[PDB]
Amino acid sequence: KRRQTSMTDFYHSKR
Amino acid sequence: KRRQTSMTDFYHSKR
Amino acid sequence: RRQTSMTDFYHSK
Amino acid sequence: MFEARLVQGSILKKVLEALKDLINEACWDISSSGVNLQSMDSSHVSLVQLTLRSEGFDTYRCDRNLAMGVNLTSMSKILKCAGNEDIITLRAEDNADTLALVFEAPNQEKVSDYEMKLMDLDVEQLGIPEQEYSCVVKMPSGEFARICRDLSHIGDAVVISCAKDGVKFSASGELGNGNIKLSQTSNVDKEEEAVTIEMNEPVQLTFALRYLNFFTKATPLSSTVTLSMSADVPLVVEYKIADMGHLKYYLAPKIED
Amino acid sequence: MFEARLVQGSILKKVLEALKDLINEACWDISSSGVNLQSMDSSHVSLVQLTLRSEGFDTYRCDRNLAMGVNLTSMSKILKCAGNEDIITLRAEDNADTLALVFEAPNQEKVSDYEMKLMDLDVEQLGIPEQEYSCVVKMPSGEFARICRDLSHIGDAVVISCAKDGVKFSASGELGNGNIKLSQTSNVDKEEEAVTIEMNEPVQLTFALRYLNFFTKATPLSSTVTLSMSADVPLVVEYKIADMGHLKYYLAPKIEDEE
Amino acid sequence: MFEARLVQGSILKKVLEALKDLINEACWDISSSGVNLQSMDSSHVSLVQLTLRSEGFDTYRCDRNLAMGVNLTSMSKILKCAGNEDIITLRAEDNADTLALVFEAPNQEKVSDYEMKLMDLDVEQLGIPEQEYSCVVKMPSGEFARICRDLSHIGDAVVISCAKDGVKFSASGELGNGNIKLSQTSNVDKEEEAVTIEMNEPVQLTFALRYLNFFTKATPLSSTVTLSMSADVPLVVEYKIADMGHLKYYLAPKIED
């Protein structure tokens, strides 16, 4: 199938 | 005035 | 604050 | 199955650059002789007839005769992705709904593939008989295009006057009028054939500049252009695609009631 | 009767390319001295005055003086039909409403003629007296055009400050402000790509960048431009048409009323 | 106080021409090490990371650490006023709200200064850990840009397949489908027009052509581009800014439900 992901789904935020 | 003619006025159409 | 025109400086002879 | 490889593929791109803006959908007739396309525009005032023979191809195989309906705009969009120095191969099986186009680079490191969807169309095909015209004028393609553009900046209709001494292109509009006179020269030239004229009877006709400006989009196809015309018959603007074949634009005149 | 032939016709072709976008209709005064044109834009904020003497023309005959009104846009459309290396002849009989333009090629194998319709118009011509200015700056045309475009990327009005050390073009906007400083050339270039300044009194003025960008459209006419200005008088952007004549752009400044 | 001079201002101009269209507001982190910028677009689908070290600068002073909020469009508008061969100096005091930019022409006769307004921003900064990817492909920047531009005429998403023999870019749309294959080039020594591939496991991924077309605006920065990727992780489009540093674009893939 086909789904657009985002950066937040792979990396984490600082503090 | 002048009138613009078409190709159909000169030749014939097949299928 | 004011845009002037050519007519404001000269004259039509 | 149908397969055709041609090295000077830039030709194809130029072909569609002349066709996409005038015709939107056409019917490519494929036969052992070569490739044919005859189609009129929406206005039925002009006709386009392209013929490109098999001898010009580097390789050509066609088992069954085909008549595939193509969207010229989509195929031109596809060919815009091909470099001018690429080798292009077209392929399509008999009972197929797709046309495959393959671009092969000279260095043989980049290979591009494309499959465009076909469509069934109802093309009205005219019967153009072979005939001689009263005046045939050969002139540089770019010069004809420049004349057409310059007169298009003036008016919407051009009056062509052809005699033995030369040709004259007249055009009038709201801003004024204009004439462009080309005189018979000295036959020492070559690819800039300083207007040559073969005349049977002097002929003056009137045509629409819009259609001629659409026609001149085929300028990069050939070095020279040939305008054939006689009294009260459509002009034939012909561009010879080098060795391959020819591309003719028929344009109906304007008569006074 | 009026007739004038010019071989270096590109000049004329360039000329109208500077005028067609700012002025739409003008009145060409034709006399034995030459050709003159004075016309304001629709906004009455700027004025253009072009002069081309007969000595620069290759052939020039005019028995009666004329004052023919032409639409610059249509005439520029006409001049677009002329090759850059064509010979252009202008002709118009006494008390005529049409102007004939003939383009003849170097090979003399293509000859084109055009007759554009003239019109009786209401030309408001002002009387500008000759005067000296407090600051006159000569600088490369391309540099002036570049400066005007870049400052147009910043704000909508430019403040030009001229002293003896150099010239400064300032402009401020919502994003910020900026200054462009051009110093009088001391590096003795002699190449003419140098900025010379002759000053009587320092002058700071403000103008609209839109009109200056319209002015810089006359860049291909000359390699250098001359900006003449004094206190509270319109700027003069002058382009010298080589040997033949000149093209001047008068632009009225922007003054602050003090509330 | 912060002050930095660079003679090769083309670097800065190209950088912002690569950033102006993708990021509108960013936060420049300034430290003794150098200059960093990390910011994602509004959609959080792509990320931009620019690094320029202090050693590449001709002069560099930074006593206090800064975190300046910038409008990329306004600063690019300012930098558009600088000639390609100009020397650019950036200056900004500690408790200041403005950034001064000084352009010095090659001839020492034109000096330009600008004062741009700063802004307080809320930038969401992610932590990207250092890692190796399954396949890294280095190829000419212009060729990658050409491939992306050509495929944008076909569809809205591109599927790239990476192996050791070459790379393949696929895209489908209403008119049809298309593939562009680039073969491993080890025969020519010139690293400019050469495509090198370091592969651990073949990788097939899908991305949006929109973001890649915005990415390719960093083409004039470097002669070659580096596509780094592993399975089901964002693509990294890297442009090496000569001696200075790098500019990488992270692009999130498309996953199957």
- Phi/psi of residue D113, nearest 5 degrees: -130, 145
Q: Which one-letter DSSP state was computed for residue D201? A: S
E153 contacts chain F (CB < 8 A): yes
Distance CA E120, CA E78 (A): 20
End-to-end CA distance of chain E: give it in Å, rounded. Answer: 57
Distance of alpha carbon E174 from alpha carbon D181, whole angstroms:
57
DSSP count for chain C of H helices, then E strands? 0, 1
**D47 and D238 in contact (C-beta within 8 Å)?**
no
Contact at 8 Å (CB) between E208 and E157? yes
DSSP structural state of residue F138: E
Structure-token match 């404001």, residue found: C8
Is E112 at the interface with chain D, CB within 8 A? yes
Please give the Cα distance from F19 to F220 (Å, whole number): 13
* Structure-block tokens of residue D17: 């650059």
Element (H, E) at E174: none
The whole-angstrom separation of Cα D178 and Cα E112 is 7
Instruction: State the helix-helix crossing angle for E72-79 and E10-19, rounded to 10 degrees.
Output: 140
Q: Which residue on chain F is closest to A4 by alpha carbon?
A: F254
Taking phi over 0 as left and psi of -120 to 50 as alpha, with beta for the rest, D146 belongs to alpha
Among F174, F176, F181, the residue with its CB nearest the CB of D114 is: F176
Separation CA F112–CA E180 (nearest Å):
4
Breaks (C-N over 2.5 A) in chain D follow: none
Q: Dig out the tokens for D200 from the structure.
A: 């049977």
CA-based nearest residue to E230, from E198, E259, E204: E204
Task: Report how far residue E220's alpha carbon sits from residue D158's, in angstroms, rounded to the nearest whole number.
Answer: 33
Locate tokens 């495959």: which residue? D100
Q: Which residues contact D57 (CB under 8 A, 6 or more apart)?
A: D4, D5, D6
In the numeric block, the tokens 């249509």 are attached to: E74
| The token pair that represents F146 in the structure block | 């050409």
- Percent of residues in chain F assigned helix, strand, coil, to nearest 5: 20, 45, 35
F20's tokens: 């102006």
3-state secondary structure of F78: helix
CA pair distance F243, C11, nearest whole angstrom: 63
What is the spatial order of strands in the sheet that D66-71 belongs to?
D66-71, D25-30, D34-40, D46-53, D245-251, D235-241, D224-229, D135-140, D196-199
Helix axes D10-19, D72-79, angle to 10 degrees: 140
Q: Three-class SS of residue F256?
A: coil
H or E stretch at F26: strand F25-30
Question: D252 vs B6: CB contact, 8 Å cut-off?
Answer: yes
* C–E interface: beta-carbon pairs under 8 A: 49
Question: How, if at all, do strands F87-92 and F98-104 pair?
Answer: antiparallel
Query: Is-contact F194 F185, C-beta < 8 A?
Result: yes
Class of residue F120 by CB neighbours under 10 A (exposed 0-12, middle 13-18, buried 19+): exposed
Give D44's contacts in chain B (Cβ within 8 Å): 6-8
Note whether E81 contacts D: Cβ–Cβ < 8 A: yes
Asked if the Cβ–Cβ distance from C6 to E256 is below 8 Å, we say no
Residues of chain A by 3-state class (helix, strand, coil), percent to 5:
20, 25, 55
Tokens of F180: 């562009």
Mutate to test the interface with E, among C6, C8, C12 (most CBs of E within 10 A): C6
Quickly count: other Cβ atoms within 10 Å of residue F132's Cβ: 9
At a CB cut-off of 8 Å and minimum separation 6, what does D194 contact?
D139, D185, D186, E107, E109
**Residues forming a β-bridge with A13:** F126
Rounded Cα distance between E166 and E184, Å, is 5
C-alpha E252/C-alpha F13 separation (Å) is 35
Q: In b/e form, how buried is each residue of E90-101, taking b as 16+ CB within 10 angstroms? A: bbbeeeeeebbb
- For the four alpha carbons of F15, F17, F18 and F21, in that order, the dihedral sign comes to positive
Spatial distance between the Cα atoms of F60 and F51, rounded to a whole number of angstroms: 15
Pick left, alpha or beta for residue E108 (phi over 0 → left; psi -120 to 50 → alpha; otherwise beta): left
Strands F126-127 and A12-13: antiparallel
Which tokens hold the place of C1?
Answer: 């604050």
**Dihedrals φ, ψ of D140, to 5°?**
-55, 140
Interface of D with F in 53-72 (CB under 8 A): 71
Give me F43's structure tokens.
């959609």
Q: What whole-number distance in Å separates Cα of residue E254 and Cα of residue E258? A: 12
Residues E157/E148, Cβ–Cβ less than 8 Å = no
Where do the H-state alpha helices sit in chain D? 10-19, 72-79, 141-152, 209-215
- d(CA D238, CA D224) in angstroms, rounded, equals 9
Tokens 């973001």 found at: F211
CB contact under 8 A, F157 and A7: no
F172 vs F257: CA distance, rounded Å: 20
CB D3 within 8 A of CB D235: no
- Distance between CA F75 and CA E175 in Å, rounded? 9
Q: Evaluate whether E205 touches E253 at the Cβ level (below 8 Å).
A: yes
Q: What is the signed CA dihedral for E205, E211, E214, E219, rounded to 10 degrees?
A: -10
Residue D199's DSSP bridge partners are D135
The residue in chain D having the minimum alpha-carbon distance to the alpha carbon of residue F169 is D112
Beta-bridged to residue E167, according to DSSP, are E162, E182
List all chains that touch chain F, counting a touch as 3 or more CB pairs closer than 8 Å: A, D, E
**D97 in contact with F at a CB cutoff of 8 Å?**
no
Query: How far does F64 lie from chain A, in Å, by closest CA?
Result: 22
List A residues 1-15 in contact with F (Cβ-Cβ < 8 A).
Answer: 1-14
d(CA F255, nearest CA chain A) in Å: 5
Residues of D in contact with E109 (CB under 8 A): 182-183, 185, 194-195
Q: Give F-chain residues touching D68 at CB under 8 angstroms.
A: none
Partners of E114 in the beta sheet?
D178, E101
User: Which residue, among E102, E98, E213, E199, has the nearest Cα to E149 in the 3D structure?
Assistant: E213
Query: Which distant-in-sequence residues (6+ apart) come within 8 Å of F68 by Cβ?
Result: F27, F28, F30, F92, F99, F118
Give the nearest chain E residue to F76 (CA atoms): E153
- Alpha-carbon distance values, F30 to D60, F41, F62, F238 (Å): 64, 21, 8, 21
B-to-D residue pairs, Cβ atoms closer than 8 angstroms: 53
Can you give F221-234 as a three-state secondary structure string? HCCEEEEEECCCCC
Give the span between the Cα atoms of D145 and F236, in whole angstroms. 48
Q: Tokens representing F39?
A: 């910011």
Residues of F in contact with D74 (CB under 8 A): 175-176
Residue E61 CA to residue E54 CA, distance in Å, equals: 9
By CA distance, what is F111's nearest residue in E? Answer: E181
- Where does D115-247 have alpha helices with state H? 141-152, 209-215
CA–CA separation, A11 and D74 (whole Å):
41
Residue E17 burial (CB < 10 Å; 0-12/13-18/19+)? middle
At residue D142, the 3 state secondary structure works out as helix
Q: Given an 8 Å threshold on Cβ–Cβ distance, is F126 in contact with A14? A: yes
Cβ F11 vs Cβ F220: under 8 Å: no
Find out whether D188 and D194 touch, Cβ atoms under 8 Å: no
Taking a C-beta distance cutoff of 8 angstroms, is the pair F137, F227 a contact?
Answer: yes
Residue B8 three-state SS: helix
E175 with F78: Cβ contact below 8 A: yes
Determine the Cα–Cα distance for residues D93 and D2; give it in Å rounded to an integer.
6
* Contact of E138 with E237, CB cutoff 8 Å: no
- d(CA F214, CA F211) in angstroms, rounded, equals 5
Q: Resolution of this entry in Å? A: 3.3
Question: Tokens 């846009």 correspond to what residue?
Answer: E73
Q: Please count the other Cβ atoms lying within 10 Å of the Cβ belonging to residue B12.
A: 8
Distance from C-alpha of E48 to C-alpha of D159, rounded to nearest angstrom: 38
Give the other-Cβ count within 10 Å of D59's Cβ. Answer: 11
Query: Within its chain, how far is the Cα of D62 from the centroid?
Result: 24
Contact assignment for A7 to F254 by CB distance below 8 Å: no
Do D254 and D160 meet the contact criterion of CB atoms below 8 Å apart? no
Number of residues in chain C: 13
The chains found to touch A (3+ Cβ pairs under 8 angstroms) are F
Token duo for residue E51: 């002069």
Per-residue exposure over E184-222, b if at least 16 CB sit within 10 Å of its own CB, e if not: bbeeeeeeeebbebebeeebebbbbbebbebbbbbbbbb
* CA angle in degrees (0–180, nearest 5) for E225-E228-E229: 145
CA distance F128 to F117: 30
Q: Please name the residues in contact with D117: beta carbons below 8 A apart, sequence gap of 6 or more.
A: D97, D98, F174, F175, F176
Q: CB of D173 within 8 A of CB of D156?
A: yes
Those residues whose C-beta lies under 8 Å from the C-beta of residue F235, and which sit 6 or more positions away, are: F205, F207, F227, F228, F229, F250, F251, F253
| Burial class for D26, CB neighbours closer than 10 Å (0-12, 13-18, 19+) | buried
Q: How far apart are CA F255 and CA F154, in angstroms?
A: 21
What is the maximal distance between C-alpha atoms in chain B?
34
Cα angle F225, F229, F234 (rounded to 5 degrees) comes to 105
* DSSP 8-state secondary structure symbol assigned to residue E156: S
Q: How many other C-beta atoms are found inside a 10 Å radius of the C-beta of residue D1?
A: 12
The amino acid occupying position D146 is R
| Other Cβ atoms closer than 10 A to E104 | 19
Across the beta sheet with F135-140, what order do the strands follow?
F66-71, F25-30, F34-40, F46-53, F245-251, F235-241, F224-229, F135-140, F196-199
CA F28 and chain centroid, separation: 14
Single out the residue of E68, E75, E60, E61 nearest to residue E15, CA to CA: E75
Least Cα distance to F96 among F158, F30, F174 occurs for: F30
How far is Cα D123 from Cα D36, in angstroms, rounded to an integer?
13
**Sign of the CA dihedral with D208 first, then D209, D214, and D219 last:** positive
CA-CA-CA-CA dihedral for F73, F76, F78, F80, to nearest 10: -130
State whether the Cα torsion D116-D119-D124-D128 is positive or negative.
Answer: positive
Distance separating alpha carbons of residues E7 and D250, to the nearest angstrom? 39
